[PDB]
UniProtKB/Swiss-Prot annotation, chain A:
Name this polypeptide is given: Capsid vertex component 2
Subunit architecture: Heterodimerizes with CVC1. Interacts with major capsid protein/MCP and triplex capsid protein 1/TRX1 at the pentamer vertices. Interacts with the large tegument protein/LTP.
Annotated function: Capsid vertex-specific component that plays a role during viral DNA encapsidation, assuring correct genome cleavage and presumably stabilizing capsids that contain full-length viral genomes. Participates in the interaction between the capsid and the tegument through interaction with the large tegument protein/LTP.
Compartments, as annotated in UniProt: Virion; Host nucleus
Residues of the full protein shown: 50 to 92 of 585
Family: Belongs to the herpesviridae CVC2 protein family.
Swiss-Prot record, chain C:
Function statement: Capsid vertex-specific component that plays a role during viral DNA encapsidation, assuring correct genome cleavage and presumably stabilizing capsids that contain full-length viral genomes.
Species this protein is from: Human herpesvirus 2 (strain HG52) (HHV-2)
Recorded family membership: Belongs to the herpesviridae CVC1 protein family.
Self-association and partners: Interacts (via C-terminus) with capsid vertex component 2/CVC2.
Keyword Manganese: no
One Pfam family cited in the UniProt record for this chain: Herpes_UL17
BP GO terms, sorted: chromosome organization
Domain of life: Viruses
One Gene Ontology term, aspect cellular component: viral capsid
UniProt lineage: Viruses, Duplodnaviria, Heunggongvirae, Peploviricota, Herviviricetes
Record's protein name: Capsid vertex component 1
Keyword field: Capsid protein, Host nucleus, Late protein, Viral genome packaging, Viral release from host cell, Virion
Cysteines paired by S-S bonds: none
Amino acid sequence: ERAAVLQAQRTAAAAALENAALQAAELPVDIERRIRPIEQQVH
Amino acid sequence: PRYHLTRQVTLTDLCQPNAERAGALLLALRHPTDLPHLARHRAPPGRQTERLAEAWGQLLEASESGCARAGLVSFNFLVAACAAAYDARDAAEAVRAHITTNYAGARLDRFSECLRAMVHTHVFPHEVMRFFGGLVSWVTQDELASVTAVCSGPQEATHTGHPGRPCSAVTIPACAFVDLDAELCLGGPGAAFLYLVFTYRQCRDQELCCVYVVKSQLPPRGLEAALERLFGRLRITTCTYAAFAELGVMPDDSPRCLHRTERVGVPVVILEGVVWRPGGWRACA
Amino acid sequence: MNAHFANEVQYDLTRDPSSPASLIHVIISSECLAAAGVPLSALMRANFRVETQTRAHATGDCTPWRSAFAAYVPADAVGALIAPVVPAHPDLLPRVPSAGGLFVSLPVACDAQGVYDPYTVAALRLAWGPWATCARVLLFSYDELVPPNTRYAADGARLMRLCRHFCRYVARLGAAAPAAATEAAAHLSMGLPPISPEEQLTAPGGDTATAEDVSITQENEEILALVQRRSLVEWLDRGWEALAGGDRPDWLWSRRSISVVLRHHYGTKQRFVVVSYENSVAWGGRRARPPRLSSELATALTEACAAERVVRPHQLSPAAQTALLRRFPALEGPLRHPRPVLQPFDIAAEVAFVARIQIACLRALGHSIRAALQGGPRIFQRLRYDFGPHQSEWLGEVTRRFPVLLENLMRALEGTAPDAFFHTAYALAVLAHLGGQLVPLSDDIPARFADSDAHYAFDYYSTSGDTLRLTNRPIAVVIDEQSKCRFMEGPHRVCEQYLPGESYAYLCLGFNRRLCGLVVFPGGFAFTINTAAYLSLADPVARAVGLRFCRGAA
Amino acid sequence: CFEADIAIPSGISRPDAAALQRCEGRVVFLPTIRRQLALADVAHESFVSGGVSPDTLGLLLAYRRRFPAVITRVLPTRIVACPVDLGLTHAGTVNLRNTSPVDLCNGDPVSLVPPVFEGQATDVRLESLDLTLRFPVPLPTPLAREIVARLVARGIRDLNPRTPGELPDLNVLYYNGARLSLVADVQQLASVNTELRSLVLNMVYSITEGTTLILTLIPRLLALSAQDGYVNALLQMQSVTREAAQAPMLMQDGERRLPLYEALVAWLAHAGQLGDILALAPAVRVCTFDGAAVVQSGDMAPVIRYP
């Protein structure tokens, strides 16, 4: 009875990777628009 | 009494039966000087009712009524004027090469505007241009008209064989192979029941006009569900599309034909022997 | 397309007052069905019925089975919405292919000023036919289903490619386009490669309120400035009305705003799609009635356990318990119930709900098998099957063969999955009896099973070789000292033609609405078992069991 | 007449040849227009569809797409039938047989209804040619329109149970006296469902924009109730009109369209046509030459054209 639950929670945590990895798909994205068009203003 | 004659005196501004064939499926023009008024009435107010006030007024420009009222509409005059409208082009348009070389598109171009204008303000072309008959005699003058084109039952298509010993007279053309809609490909023996349906498309194809004849061994109660099926022009919502009346019975399915020779090569269907039950119209849905 | 649309007409229900809802379009693809246990050939054989019911996580009951719609189309299911197919013009939009599956939008339980409850499951069921063998069950929580926001930023590149492909189709084909189509092409060239629908999932862009992204640009392009000193969519309608010849409200939302969001499935590591149009009354539509969803429970119980590093919220601090209870009051269930019949705060809480029933029946089996077989038994016989003279030496083996079976029957009853156990006869004969303490699911029960106690219902196991199940169908054989057998009334399975216990290499195993079962061996040698003296199913535990497994008959 | 014949195909049970004699003036549904046709498509085995027999609402839908025909003269070789749909051109007024418990009137339109009566089954059996014959029951048309509304609504109660088992039976009819009980045995769903939908879909279009102003005068109806005879008798007791009593919604665009006049048009278009789209079309009218005001049960009434 545990082994189904201990698998199904593990399959959830395997799915919660790409639930969070696709949610962490903005961490190299949210920085370019807040830096790059501001420096040529300084120019 | 299985032989009749009818007569109406009109202009040859319309059909010009001397330019027509011996067999043509003539309409009248009942209520001819009508429709400035019903342009204003019977329509919801988002239709801008000042359109048909000029639209038919440009028709009789191409055609003063006088004492010879505008009437006796040909079968050709609706097919070619809707040839650009319905789903047949360069084959229904061969009816325009039939008219303008024998009759005139000047009267078509004013009326194809009417076919977008009559259907615009919900003045639908059924119950105007009521059925008259099969163009028996053409005792017309030069620019005027006097036609006997009998209504009144089966006798119009019986009185065709008796007058001329050689070949056959009238023999009731369909005037387009696109017309005479070959319904009931589920084929069997019996008798044919002919009808006159105006299929519409309201604000989808911008007030479509259509004239064609159906082919069925079906009753009027087996025709309305046959009018709900087989259509792809349901995509409307206003309403009251697909009116129809009885063109009557062709009491033989054996005598239909397939030709392209008339009078310009126009495809044409011979239909010999017809009980012309004049029928009644219906338009609700 | 339209299965997402016609379910919105069931979302147009409204009328009599009840707890207010939403609707989420969910596109399962091929391998999420295939890894689930769905045969893709049998649904490929477009409107299809789906029986759905919704289940809370903590406590409580379930929804009855709701008849829904489906559209199972093998195609690029993301690309078919994006690049649809005109019958005359299938190359109106050439694209990149993809996987495909069923189109089913699913409703959402909410609140007044809706705060959706995660961990709480809506259960799908695909019914290939009547039988439970023609059935699968799918699990979906709102954490799995609900993104916070959509990605209509991917809709921006799509719509101007549409106008260029109306500029691409007329220039290639030429004068073969009719009079309404030769106009609307060049009216899209004065307004400014294949369309890959998978890039709209994999390009990292989504929704934003953008009011913070105007002030961050107005104070960015004024620096700049200080140093210095009919639409196209109306021509898309005639683009369709000439190439198709009609309106097609299926294609009408392929012109409007389309967000195509990728998510994942917590059961089998799979992917699926979350869809919202613009004109949808469903969730994520830009024509939608309040109340809408609130991602508050998905932030409260997490961060009160994440900032406190409470790994399991039964280890939550007593002030940290009740302060959340002062905020969100529906959590008294999964925190303050002595023995909830559904387990509080676990992923497989619905799965552990099932596996107990798999356990508790086997002990009701296993201590009942010992009951009728306490000592040396006298079983003499119960059926009428006469012998030939050398046929008795076959039963000379059955003396010797006997005791290894009753282990391996119960081993195989252990050996099945419980998901594969609910299609067998004993798992539904109890439901014919738990409905008698209501019509159970898949209607495998005949019309005359509920008449007498003489209407039994069998399963069939292989005697020799491997001890394996030899049925799909519970085979209900009416049984009359002695009593001869008789069938009932009535895609081809081998063993289903015989009477129970009629021949060798067959173990026969029937059950009742009385739940007094039979174990029938070949040769008449059978005996009743009072499993009703060993079924210990508590009714408040069993009342969440039956409602998920019964069907209200009309 | 435009003569149409149906031959006697194969053999004769010798009293059953006399059974075809006493069916003179009845109606055959033949699904064609033929100069000769077999007797196989005539009987109720042809009325039975694939695998299943129609219900008395499905037989309405089965009598929809076939053609009635009048028995004119009975030979031992053929039976001459006159095609009602076309060949009703009879100044001789080709004669029919009334097989119905109601003594009719003079001047009734007559429409055909399947046998649904408790005691007038019209079942005649042929065993040499294994066929079953249900003759339609010619009836007056308001009494015909009182029947078809019952049988569909009885099948409307076949969709939903809910209520206790004591339902109003829809099985007591009234013509001047004359308590009639009909048969309620089987209600096939698709014959109910397609008949129910056209009852829904026509009642959709029969409401329009100017129709809504009439709904304001519902409390005006009961003001005439306690001050006259005609209205109070018009207002039924088993009506929702007495139940619903316990407003322009301006939206006025243009106001030159005659909104009240346009309401009565499209209402009459679909709610005005509810008897004939559900049932068969009446084309038979009572017309006796001798001045007889009624026509007895079993008589031979002269028949004229469409009403």
